[PDB]
Amino acid sequence: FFTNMVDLFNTMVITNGDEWLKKKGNMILKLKDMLNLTLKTIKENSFYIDHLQLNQSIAKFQALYLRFTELSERDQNPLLLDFIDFSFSNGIKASYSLKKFIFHNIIASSNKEKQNNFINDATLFVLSDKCLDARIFVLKNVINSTLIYEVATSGSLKSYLVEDKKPKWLELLHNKIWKNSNAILAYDVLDHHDLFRFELLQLSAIFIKADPEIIAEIKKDIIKFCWNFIKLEDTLIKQSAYLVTSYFISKFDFPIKVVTQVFVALLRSSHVEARYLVKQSLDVLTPVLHERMNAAGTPDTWINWVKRVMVENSSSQNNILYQFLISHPDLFFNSRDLFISNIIHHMNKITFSDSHTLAIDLASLILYWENKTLSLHLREACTAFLIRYVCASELGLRAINILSELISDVKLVYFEKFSENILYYCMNALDVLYVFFKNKTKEWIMENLPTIQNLLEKCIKSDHHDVQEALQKVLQVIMKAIKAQGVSVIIEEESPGKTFIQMLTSVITQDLQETSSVTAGVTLAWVLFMNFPDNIVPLLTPLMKTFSKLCKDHLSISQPKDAMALEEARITTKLLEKVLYILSLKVSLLGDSRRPFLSTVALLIDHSMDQNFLRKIVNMSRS
Amino acid sequence: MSLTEQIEQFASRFRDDDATLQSRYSTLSELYDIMELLNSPEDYHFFLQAVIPLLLNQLKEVPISYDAHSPEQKLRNSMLDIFNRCLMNQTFQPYAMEVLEFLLSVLPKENEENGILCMKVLTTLFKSFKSILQDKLDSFIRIIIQIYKNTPNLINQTFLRSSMFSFKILSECPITMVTLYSSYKQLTSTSLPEFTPLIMNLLNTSISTEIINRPAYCDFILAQIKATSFLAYVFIRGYAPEFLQDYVNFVPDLIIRLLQDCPSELSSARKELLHATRHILSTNYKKLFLPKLDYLFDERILIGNGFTMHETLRPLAYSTVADFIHNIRSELQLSEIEKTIKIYTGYLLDESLALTVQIMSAKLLLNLVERILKLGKENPQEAPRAKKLLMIIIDSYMNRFKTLNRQYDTIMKYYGRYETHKKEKAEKLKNSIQDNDKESEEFMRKVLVEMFDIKNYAPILLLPTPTNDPIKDAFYLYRTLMSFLKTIIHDLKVFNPPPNEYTVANPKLWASVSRVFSYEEVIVFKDLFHECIIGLKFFKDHVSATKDARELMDYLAFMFMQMD
């Protein structure tokens, strides 16, 4: 019967352009009593509840009710009457059907001023106990939504109040704010939704954060209202109250004693559920606490409080909040030094999980102090931590960059212990790239040449049956190590290493049976050819031999264009082919090896190749 | 300073604290100024043999007088948290003989900081026992038994803080459990005040507050309830080594009671209370008699007391209740199935909580469709009443899609940020130290609407704004719910009316595809097709379509093939 009455009235309003009542609104109230009576009938007699057609009928009824409400001259009472209508039951909001009408209610700049009147009887709906807590929570939604909409996409309270002209609800808010005494009768009167006190806290935060200078006679009531919330026992309400009182004492009206009290209450006993609240609270409170603590010279105890609480809950999880307390502002620091040993020990204890991104931001703090200057054991402590972290495995590259800048401001061979062995080899190679580059910075890498020679002997002979990344990433540190201004004035110390690496290229180019031995010779011959004009000129014919093998297995990858799997191991052969081109080409002192080399070059021009190195060989023919 | 060099830092302060009012930095702050954090692999014993006589002579004095506001309580708590910070590998008995004499003195008294060493010093002796066995297992465990015997005197004197978390579990337990059974039963199955039965005369239902102003102190109930939640957490471990006996039907009423009278002024205890509840419900035989004695009706939003901390305990409690409801799946008749889909569709359409809980609720309704089909196949008389249930849950799926589509452009705004916060976070990666693409050319060429957004501008944010991919969450929701919809719409084929009224020449084509629906079911199907066609705007470029949009178009096409 309810569905029949609803779609009969919906048909009668659809067949006309506007309301058949011509915005009278007497059958719609009859439909409202119809809905209340069928809800009471379905609640008393338990036959068949919560249907499809009941929900669709209620949706159609809300559609026609809110269609009539946007088509009237008194829109202020029947909206709140509709909020009364589903006090007992029937959802919490018509999602994007009632809230869309309220988003129409929030007109920009209140030109018509109907919304100001709505806010007036809205807060009269809030203070009067004419409904349960859920519809007063929807009243929170509409009131705080239009307030922060005027705050956000306009000036912060610049259109409603200009010279205390028409406040018209702020005195009702004074009457509301004055009742907070005796815990706003929270204990005396039982309210089971705690959204009401959070509504009031957020409403005060709107007034504090929006414009605390045009209003001056309300501020004692504001601070006593936001201070009565401190003495509760819950956690999120307590930290929201801490956040709003730090908003106020960061804005203006600064006291002397209790700002240290709310500071030490902020940085003590904060568990997991309120981390973002204390982050915002400290980030708002501390830049004015620094400038109002240093108004007198000798008070600097607000670093001593952080030190006392940091050594209080030592080596625990709650210290991490203080560990990135000192990281988000940094210019209020580089005035203490026990902080440095504290954070070094903390990152060395927290590296062994998922909080590694914390510890790097600890280390990125330390360098920011060092560049602020422009101890001793802690230097080798933090460099040992950095080396152990980068060889333990984005942010590792940040660790690389910070160690590279930190060395120039352990210094012994530790990498003899470095499956995952190839990954440790690559990370060791990335470490020794710069840790050999950043010491003895006058091209003075010759004293440790036997030690680093025995260190790298187990990875210059790497690619015999394993991956290419070891040689492809040790190539850079070999390219740094084999530039030592040559051997013409110094003793023959780099020269046995040169003869050793050239006989290694020789003995790895005698192996031509698989596609693993051909990479080591061409890579190390290329770094010898780049870093020295002299190379194995009596032994250039194995380079021609491997070049011909590269041509004859380019014949194997000629009739396919690409590989189905293992695609990298063809374009890396093309890459070392571009290497071997220039390597066997830039010296024209060949003997009988010129004509087969040129016939292979002509065969390379013959068959279908890629253009990016055909242009290289026509530039080479231009040379 | 990781050696004996600390001793000359307090060799002048090696004497005891005389005039303890102003001497707050002499002897007690040795683990507080600098000498608390330095490395000590085997560097402790160079001074650890000086800490034990010094702290021993500290603990010889400073008696049990607790009422005065710290003439001596400061150094008492100082040596207390010195005792937790020290980690040792040797000389365990010099620690152990000098700590028991204070915990054997504070058995019946717990008011005004009266003996709060115990919840730390018994844990430190537990830690030293877990380092290496000291064959002292029948001496220290009697004190908590005398605490349990003191609790009748404690409840008669109030017309607490046991903290039994690791006090009875030692991970081996080669002892008896009958004394543990009696010490649990002496306080579990009792009315904890003498007033909780007389508040059940107003039960017609539930109590939001703990007590309506019957006890004047109002802090004993808070501590006693906290201790009861501690013990209700800790007897779960006992179940796995040995089966518990002498009572099996006494846990559900105390579970419902403790869920009803948790205080709204705290939220920590509800976490391990729900953890103990799911640790009960993770078993095989304990989860059978529990749904009968709660009647699946005290498992509602009474478990959130105070609506400013029933926003972090939502996914835990909803996941445990849904996991248990999926675990039984055979005890449920149709009325409980109606009652649980009526609340879990509301959990699905609730926008205030996370996406994973909504996906879990949709998964729960998909797990219930088999029980609905089997119950409808049992008795055909309620076979229409089952079929309408299958038009409720998929209706909520149609609503959930709708709740996404109205946010469409708003989602796009965050996607714009998800471009820039990605685009500035991948071009900081090309600053690597790698080569063979630069030194090669160096060597060569040298010789040649704000509607949903209003929540994000509140001054009390209480949670950081997310930076996850909104389109990935939208595709996850659409793919999961459309697979569920394909399953349920195919499963609706068993509730066809008999084809003798339509008297078709081929009933073998019937009961496979062709069926009937009401008006309010084909309206739901029309809105489902409408919302699924609208929802393909999230997966445009931002017979030429993307892969995820093509997959969802295959789901939408296959979903409507088995409809009549």
PDB file of N, CA, C and O in Angstrom, chain A residues 588-618:
ATOM      1  N   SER A 588      94.045   0.864 -36.967  1.00  0.00           N
ATOM      2  CA  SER A 588      94.149   0.337 -38.322  1.00  0.00           C
ATOM      3  C   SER A 588      95.535  -0.236 -38.593  1.00  0.00           C
ATOM      4  O   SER A 588      96.000  -0.250 -39.733  1.00  0.00           O
ATOM      5  N   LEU A 589      96.205  -0.706 -37.541  1.00  0.00           N
ATOM      6  CA  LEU A 589      97.528  -1.303 -37.644  1.00  0.00           C
ATOM      7  C   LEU A 589      97.455  -2.819 -37.748  1.00  0.00           C
ATOM      8  O   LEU A 589      98.348  -3.523 -37.266  1.00  0.00           O
ATOM      9  N   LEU A 590      96.386  -3.330 -38.348  1.00  0.00           N
ATOM     10  CA  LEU A 590      96.206  -4.759 -38.515  1.00  0.00           C
ATOM     11  C   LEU A 590      97.157  -5.296 -39.581  1.00  0.00           C
ATOM     12  O   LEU A 590      97.641  -4.565 -40.450  1.00  0.00           O
ATOM     13  N   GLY A 591      97.416  -6.597 -39.511  1.00  0.00           N
ATOM     14  CA  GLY A 591      98.261  -7.247 -40.492  1.00  0.00           C
ATOM     15  C   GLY A 591      97.445  -7.863 -41.604  1.00  0.00           C
ATOM     16  O   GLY A 591      96.868  -7.150 -42.430  1.00  0.00           O
ATOM     17  N   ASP A 592      97.378  -9.193 -41.629  1.00  0.00           N
ATOM     18  CA  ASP A 592      96.502  -9.900 -42.555  1.00  0.00           C
ATOM     19  C   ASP A 592      95.055  -9.949 -42.081  1.00  0.00           C
ATOM     20  O   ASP A 592      94.218 -10.568 -42.746  1.00  0.00           O
ATOM     21  N   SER A 593      94.755  -9.328 -40.948  1.00  0.00           N
ATOM     22  CA  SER A 593      93.438  -9.359 -40.344  1.00  0.00           C
ATOM     23  C   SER A 593      92.526  -8.246 -40.843  1.00  0.00           C
ATOM     24  O   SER A 593      91.431  -8.075 -40.302  1.00  0.00           O
ATOM     25  N   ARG A 594      92.940  -7.482 -41.852  1.00  0.00           N
ATOM     26  CA  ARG A 594      92.080  -6.395 -42.300  1.00  0.00           C
ATOM     27  C   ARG A 594      90.992  -6.882 -43.253  1.00  0.00           C
ATOM     28  O   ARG A 594      89.841  -6.452 -43.143  1.00  0.00           O
ATOM     29  N   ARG A 595      91.314  -7.802 -44.153  1.00  0.00           N
ATOM     30  CA  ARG A 595      90.367  -8.236 -45.177  1.00  0.00           C
ATOM     31  C   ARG A 595      89.238  -9.128 -44.644  1.00  0.00           C
ATOM     32  O   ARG A 595      88.087  -8.904 -45.050  1.00  0.00           O
ATOM     33  N   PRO A 596      89.464 -10.123 -43.757  1.00  0.00           N
ATOM     34  CA  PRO A 596      88.293 -10.809 -43.180  1.00  0.00           C
ATOM     35  C   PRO A 596      87.450  -9.922 -42.282  1.00  0.00           C
ATOM     36  O   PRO A 596      86.222 -10.084 -42.256  1.00  0.00           O
ATOM     37  N   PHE A 597      88.068  -8.960 -41.591  1.00  0.00           N
ATOM     38  CA  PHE A 597      87.314  -7.998 -40.794  1.00  0.00           C
ATOM     39  C   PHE A 597      86.424  -7.127 -41.673  1.00  0.00           C
ATOM     40  O   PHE A 597      85.245  -6.919 -41.362  1.00  0.00           O
ATOM     41  N   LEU A 598      86.956  -6.653 -42.803  1.00  0.00           N
ATOM     42  CA  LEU A 598      86.153  -5.835 -43.702  1.00  0.00           C
ATOM     43  C   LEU A 598      85.087  -6.651 -44.421  1.00  0.00           C
ATOM     44  O   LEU A 598      84.012  -6.121 -44.722  1.00  0.00           O
ATOM     45  N   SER A 599      85.337  -7.940 -44.672  1.00  0.00           N
ATOM     46  CA  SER A 599      84.288  -8.762 -45.273  1.00  0.00           C
ATOM     47  C   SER A 599      83.165  -9.031 -44.280  1.00  0.00           C
ATOM     48  O   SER A 599      81.990  -9.078 -44.663  1.00  0.00           O
ATOM     49  N   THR A 600      83.500  -9.191 -42.995  1.00  0.00           N
ATOM     50  CA  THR A 600      82.450  -9.294 -41.985  1.00  0.00           C
ATOM     51  C   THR A 600      81.687  -7.986 -41.812  1.00  0.00           C
ATOM     52  O   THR A 600      80.475  -8.015 -41.572  1.00  0.00           O
ATOM     53  N   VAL A 601      82.361  -6.839 -41.959  1.00  0.00           N
ATOM     54  CA  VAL A 601      81.664  -5.549 -41.922  1.00  0.00           C
ATOM     55  C   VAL A 601      80.700  -5.423 -43.099  1.00  0.00           C
ATOM     56  O   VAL A 601      79.555  -4.974 -42.941  1.00  0.00           O
ATOM     57  N   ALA A 602      81.131  -5.859 -44.286  1.00  0.00           N
ATOM     58  CA  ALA A 602      80.251  -5.843 -45.451  1.00  0.00           C
ATOM     59  C   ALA A 602      79.085  -6.812 -45.296  1.00  0.00           C
ATOM     60  O   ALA A 602      77.974  -6.518 -45.749  1.00  0.00           O
ATOM     61  N   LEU A 603      79.314  -7.954 -44.642  1.00  0.00           N
ATOM     62  CA  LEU A 603      78.227  -8.880 -44.339  1.00  0.00           C
ATOM     63  C   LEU A 603      77.258  -8.279 -43.328  1.00  0.00           C
ATOM     64  O   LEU A 603      76.056  -8.565 -43.369  1.00  0.00           O
ATOM     65  N   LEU A 604      77.763  -7.445 -42.423  1.00  0.00           N
ATOM     66  CA  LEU A 604      76.892  -6.769 -41.470  1.00  0.00           C
ATOM     67  C   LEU A 604      76.039  -5.711 -42.155  1.00  0.00           C
ATOM     68  O   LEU A 604      74.866  -5.534 -41.809  1.00  0.00           O
ATOM     69  N   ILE A 605      76.608  -5.004 -43.134  1.00  0.00           N
ATOM     70  CA  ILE A 605      75.803  -4.088 -43.944  1.00  0.00           C
ATOM     71  C   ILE A 605      74.824  -4.870 -44.825  1.00  0.00           C
ATOM     72  O   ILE A 605      73.745  -4.367 -45.165  1.00  0.00           O
ATOM     73  N   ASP A 606      75.158  -6.122 -45.159  1.00  0.00           N
ATOM     74  CA  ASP A 606      74.342  -6.920 -46.072  1.00  0.00           C
ATOM     75  C   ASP A 606      72.996  -7.275 -45.442  1.00  0.00           C
ATOM     76  O   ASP A 606      71.940  -6.909 -45.969  1.00  0.00           O
ATOM     77  N   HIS A 607      73.008  -7.975 -44.315  1.00  0.00           N
ATOM     78  CA  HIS A 607      71.764  -8.503 -43.778  1.00  0.00           C
ATOM     79  C   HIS A 607      71.050  -7.471 -42.906  1.00  0.00           C
ATOM     80  O   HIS A 607      71.581  -6.405 -42.588  1.00  0.00           O
ATOM     81  N   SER A 608      69.827  -7.819 -42.503  1.00  0.00           N
ATOM     82  CA  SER A 608      68.919  -6.886 -41.837  1.00  0.00           C
ATOM     83  C   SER A 608      69.352  -6.669 -40.394  1.00  0.00           C
ATOM     84  O   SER A 608      69.282  -7.585 -39.569  1.00  0.00           O
ATOM     85  N   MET A 609      69.772  -5.449 -40.086  1.00  0.00           N
ATOM     86  CA  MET A 609      70.211  -5.058 -38.755  1.00  0.00           C
ATOM     87  C   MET A 609      69.343  -3.907 -38.247  1.00  0.00           C
ATOM     88  O   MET A 609      68.346  -3.527 -38.866  1.00  0.00           O
ATOM     89  N   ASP A 610      69.731  -3.353 -37.104  1.00  0.00           N
ATOM     90  CA  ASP A 610      69.081  -2.181 -36.547  1.00  0.00           C
ATOM     91  C   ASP A 610      69.868  -0.944 -36.954  1.00  0.00           C
ATOM     92  O   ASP A 610      71.091  -0.985 -37.101  1.00  0.00           O
ATOM     93  N   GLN A 611      69.150   0.168 -37.117  1.00  0.00           N
ATOM     94  CA  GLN A 611      69.745   1.364 -37.697  1.00  0.00           C
ATOM     95  C   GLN A 611      70.684   2.079 -36.737  1.00  0.00           C
ATOM     96  O   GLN A 611      71.583   2.794 -37.193  1.00  0.00           O
ATOM     97  N   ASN A 612      70.504   1.885 -35.426  1.00  0.00           N
ATOM     98  CA  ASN A 612      71.203   2.683 -34.424  1.00  0.00           C
ATOM     99  C   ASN A 612      72.698   2.398 -34.365  1.00  0.00           C
ATOM    100  O   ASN A 612      73.441   3.205 -33.799  1.00  0.00           O
ATOM    101  N   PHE A 613      73.154   1.275 -34.916  1.00  0.00           N
ATOM    102  CA  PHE A 613      74.581   1.039 -35.065  1.00  0.00           C
ATOM    103  C   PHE A 613      75.022   0.972 -36.517  1.00  0.00           C
ATOM    104  O   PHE A 613      76.227   1.056 -36.785  1.00  0.00           O
ATOM    105  N   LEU A 614      74.088   0.865 -37.462  1.00  0.00           N
ATOM    106  CA  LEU A 614      74.443   1.103 -38.854  1.00  0.00           C
ATOM    107  C   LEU A 614      74.839   2.557 -39.067  1.00  0.00           C
ATOM    108  O   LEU A 614      75.764   2.849 -39.835  1.00  0.00           O
ATOM    109  N   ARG A 615      74.185   3.483 -38.360  1.00  0.00           N
ATOM    110  CA  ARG A 615      74.641   4.868 -38.403  1.00  0.00           C
ATOM    111  C   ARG A 615      75.993   5.030 -37.718  1.00  0.00           C
ATOM    112  O   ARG A 615      76.803   5.868 -38.137  1.00  0.00           O
ATOM    113  N   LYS A 616      76.277   4.202 -36.710  1.00  0.00           N
ATOM    114  CA  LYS A 616      77.588   4.229 -36.074  1.00  0.00           C
ATOM    115  C   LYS A 616      78.674   3.764 -37.032  1.00  0.00           C
ATOM    116  O   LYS A 616      79.744   4.375 -37.107  1.00  0.00           O
ATOM    117  N   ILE A 617      78.408   2.713 -37.808  1.00  0.00           N
ATOM    118  CA  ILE A 617      79.442   2.256 -38.730  1.00  0.00           C
ATOM    119  C   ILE A 617      79.550   3.138 -39.968  1.00  0.00           C
ATOM    120  O   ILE A 617      80.631   3.202 -40.562  1.00  0.00           O
ATOM    121  N   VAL A 618      78.502   3.877 -40.352  1.00  0.00           N
ATOM    122  CA  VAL A 618      78.742   4.831 -41.435  1.00  0.00           C
ATOM    123  C   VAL A 618      79.466   6.075 -40.915  1.00  0.00           C
ATOM    124  O   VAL A 618      80.238   6.692 -41.658  1.00  0.00           O
TER     125      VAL A 618
END
